[PDB]
Amino acid sequence: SQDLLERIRAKEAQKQLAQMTRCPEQEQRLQRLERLP
Amino acid sequence: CRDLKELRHLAVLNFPKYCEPVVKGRDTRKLWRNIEPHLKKAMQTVYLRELPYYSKFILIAAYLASYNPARTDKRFFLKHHFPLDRLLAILYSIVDSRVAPTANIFSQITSLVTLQLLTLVGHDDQLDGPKYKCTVSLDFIRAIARTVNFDIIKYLYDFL
Amino acid sequence: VGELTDEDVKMITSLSKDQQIGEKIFASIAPSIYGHEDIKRGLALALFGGEPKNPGGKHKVRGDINVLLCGDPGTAKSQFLKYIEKVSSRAIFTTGQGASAVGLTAYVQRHPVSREWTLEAGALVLADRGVCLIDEFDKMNDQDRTSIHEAMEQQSISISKAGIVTSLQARCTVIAAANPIGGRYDPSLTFSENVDLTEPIISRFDILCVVRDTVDPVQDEMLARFVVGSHVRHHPSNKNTYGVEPLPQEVLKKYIIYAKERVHPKLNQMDQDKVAKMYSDLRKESMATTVRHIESMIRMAEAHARIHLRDYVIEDDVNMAIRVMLESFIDTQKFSVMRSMRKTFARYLS
Amino acid sequence: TVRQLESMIRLSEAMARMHCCDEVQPKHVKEAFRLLNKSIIRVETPDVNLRLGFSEYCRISNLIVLHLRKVEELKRSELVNWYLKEIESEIDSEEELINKKRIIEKVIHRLTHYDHVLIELTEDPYLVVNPNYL
Ligand SMILES: Nc1ncnc2c1ncn2[C@@H]1O[C@H](COP(=O)(O)OP(=O)(O)OP(O)(O)=S)[C@@H](O)[C@H]1O
Numbered sequence: 186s187q188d189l190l191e192r193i194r195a196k197e198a199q200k201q202l203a204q205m206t207r208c209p210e211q212e213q214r215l216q217r218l219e220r221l222p
Numbered sequence: 223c224r225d226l227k228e229l230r231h232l233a234v235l236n237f238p239k240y241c242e243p244v245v246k247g248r249d250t251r252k253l254w255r256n257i258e259p260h261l262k263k264a265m266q267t268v269y270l271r272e273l274p275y276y277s278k279f280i281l282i283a284a285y286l287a288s289y290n291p292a293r294t295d296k297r298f299f300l301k302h303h304f305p306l307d308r309l310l311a312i313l314y315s316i317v318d319s320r321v322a323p324t325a326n327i328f329s330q331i332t333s334l335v336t337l338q339l340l341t342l343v344g345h346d347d348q349l350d351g352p353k354y355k356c357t358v359s360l361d362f363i364r365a366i367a368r369t370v371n372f373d374i375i376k377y378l379y380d381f382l
Numbered sequence: 383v384g385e386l387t388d389e390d391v392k393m394i395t396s397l398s399k400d401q402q403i404g405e406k407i408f409a410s411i412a413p414s415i416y417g418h419e420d421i422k423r424g425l426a427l428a429l430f431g432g433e434p435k436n437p438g439g440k441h442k443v444r445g446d447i448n449v450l451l452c453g454d455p456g457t458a459k460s461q462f463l464k465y466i467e468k469v470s471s472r473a474i475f476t477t478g479q480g481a482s483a484v485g486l487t488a489y490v491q492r493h494p495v496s497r498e499w500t501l502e503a504g505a506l507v508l509a510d511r512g513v514c515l516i517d518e519f520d521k522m523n524d525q526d527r528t529s530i531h532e533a534m535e536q537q538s539i540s541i542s543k544a545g546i547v548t549s550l551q552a553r554c555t556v557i558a559a560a561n562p563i564g565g566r567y568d569p570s571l572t573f574s575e576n577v578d579l580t581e582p583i584i585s586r587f588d589i590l591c592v593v594r595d596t597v598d599p600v601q602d603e604m605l606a607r608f609v610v611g612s613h614v615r616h617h618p619s620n621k622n623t624y625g626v627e628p629l630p631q632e633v634l635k636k637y638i639i640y641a642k643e644r645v646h647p648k649l650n651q652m653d654q655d656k657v658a659k660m661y662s663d664l665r666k667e668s669m670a671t672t673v674r675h676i677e678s679m680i681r682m683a684e685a686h687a688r689i690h691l692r693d694y695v696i697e698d699d700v701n702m703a704i705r706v707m708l709e710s711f712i713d714t715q716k717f718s719v720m721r722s723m724r725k726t727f728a729r730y731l732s
Numbered sequence: 733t734v735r736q737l738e739s740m741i742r743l744s745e746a747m748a749r750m751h752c753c754d755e756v757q758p759k760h761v762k763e764a765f766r767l768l769n770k771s772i773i774r775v776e777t778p779d780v781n782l783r784l785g786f787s788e789y790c791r792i793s794n795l796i797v798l799h800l801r802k803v804e805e806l807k808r809s810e811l812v813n814w815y816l817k818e819i820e821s822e823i824d825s826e827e828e829l830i831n832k833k834r835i836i837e838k839v840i841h842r843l844t845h846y847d848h849v850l851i852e853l854t855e856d857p858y859l860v861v862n863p864n865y866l
């Protein structure tokens with residue numbers, strides 16, 4: 186059913202949001218680290 | 223149509239065709255599909271329920287005289303650059319053949335006046351300077367022009 | 383002529399013996415443009431050119447055809463001019479705004495180093511023996527127009543400036559483009575009234591072609607189909623009315639060169655009575671509304687004979703020249719009289 | 733004139749380049765047709781009674797009429813189910829689903845009872861298109 190798929194997608198989105206609760210600056214410095222040399 | 227009488231009259235008129243399909247053999251889709259085009263044909267009329275040769279030329283000339291300002295007359299007819307005389311000049315210009323001023327054309331003018339296609343404006347006693355107006359719809363004059371092989375749109379100043 | 387390969391000559395001769403050579407020649411011009419047979423016909427006929435003559439060394443009869451093109455916007459006149467620019471072996475393109483009288487003609491100048499009077503050739507002078515294209519000729523200043531008539535009529539320019547008098551040849555084919563005043567051509571007015579040019583300038587022109595815009599659904603279908611097909615064909619990644627296959631561009635160019643440089647027709651089988659009667663009728667129907675028209679028709683017949691690579695002119699050339707000239711003339715008249723003109727001259731148009 | 737046709741082809745090519753698609757699709761043509769048509773344009777369209785935009789209202793009406801006319805060669809619940817199936821690519825939360833249900837119910841009722849473009853035939857009534865909508 187569509188409801189089951191949407192709830193699964195919402196659960197995945199919530200899990201990924203909890204994953205990205207980490208500070209965005211952590212990856213921004215990593216991005217800059219490749220540009221430094 | 224919100225008129226109860228008119229809607230009831232329409233229902234009375236159209237009911238037999240409503241009941242034909244079931245007689246031919248509660249099928250809502252079947253009835254609607256069989257009946258839809260007739261309804262569209264009926265809605266075309268909600269509230270509604272061959273001239274002689276020279277007469278056509280007279281009519282088109284009268285229409286041109288009525289709907290074309292006099293200043294542009296020579297611009298449309300003179301080869302190099304409303305009263306009855308203007309109509310006569312325009313008619314002589316339009317027709318490729320020399321038409322004699324037989325009394326029959328005057329009889330045609332008077333008959334066209336009688337048929338409520340041309341309205342007399344001036345006094346009835348004044349039959350030397352009479353005034354006329356044309357009351358023919360544009361679609362009618364376009365249709366009658368087509369049967370003559372004449373393009374009236376090319377001479378209408380307003381459209382240009 | 384010396385550079386021509388004998389294979390090119392044999393191909394040209396094999397094309398000449400074809401009975402449908404004219405049809406494929408006309409269809410070979412502007413493949414990317416649809417319809418408009420009359421304009422390409424007239425431009426090709428002018429491109430082939432007539433035979434200039436100098437009877438007795440007293441007066442010189444030009445063998446050049448001047449074409450003026452007035453049309454409603456959206457008919458790809460500039461595309462035709464650009465194609466003519468590319469095809470011609472010698473071609474110069476000028477715009478109306480950027481062409482001054484001093485620029486178009488030769489002018490006297492003092493040399494920056496040695497400081498003697500010197501002549502610098504204009505566009506028309508460099509167009510000698512070639513073709514000159516004028517775009518937006520209706521934009522010409524009247525003062526700039528004044529110098530044009532001399533080169534149009536005599537195909538030579540006499541410069542009398544700063545104590546220097548010189549004569550230079552101006553044998554060129556001139557193609558001029560113009561737009562009607564107000565942006566739309568009025569069929570209820572004479573051709574002279576719709577174009578802001580004096581009568582002598584129009585008289586110098588030999589062929590006049592007017593193009594209008596009409597809303598025809600079938601013609602719209604044809605235009606859309608042809609345009610989208612052309613767009614599909616000419617993609618860089620991917621890189622007729624007469625029913626005849628167009629010729630290759632190089633073959634057409636070689637044919638034009640050979641025809642220009644070999645054929646010299648002779649008008650020894652012309653019936654003067656027919657043309658005399660036609661010219662009398664032309665006078666009758668023009669005063670109701672000249673010699674150079676007859677001269678243009680004569681050089682037109684000469685050019686048409688040159689198309690078929692014939693040393694002598696057959697009367698079919700005269701018939702086609704009469705037909706196209708009459709079509710050009712009636713197109714310049716008012717609507718109220720062109721029907722009567724067509725009825726009167728239905729003998730030749732049929 | 734033909735210049736506008738060339739502009740239309742250029743607009744289709746620009747839409748194709750925007751989406752990084754190696755081939756041109758008719759969706760680009762449909763998108764560019766509106767922009768060529770609109771000409772005179774207001775600052776902002778007024779709201780329609782929770783409010784919804786006029787362009788979105790026309791979009792929903794066009795989609796529903798096209799589907800009904802295609803099916804002619806339905807039921808209220810079945811059509812709503814189809815719409816929810818088609819709009820699945822955009823909804824990401826339950827609140828959006830209930831909002832879309834509210835919107836579609838309101839739009840269907842409004843078209844049935846105010847614009848008369850949809851005619852009811854006798855809890856799941858049959859819906860038919862007014863035969864004079866193009
Ligand atoms: N009959 C036609 N067939 C094919 N393409 C055409 C045709 N008419 C116009 N076009 C296209 O339309 C484009 C623009 O036309 P233009 O040449 O600018 O119009 P125009 O008739 O020269 O009037 P102006 O000089 O621009 S005001 C051309 O480059 C062609 O690609």
Ligand SMILES: [Mg+2]
Binds near residue numbers: 458459460461
């Ligand atoms: Mg142009």
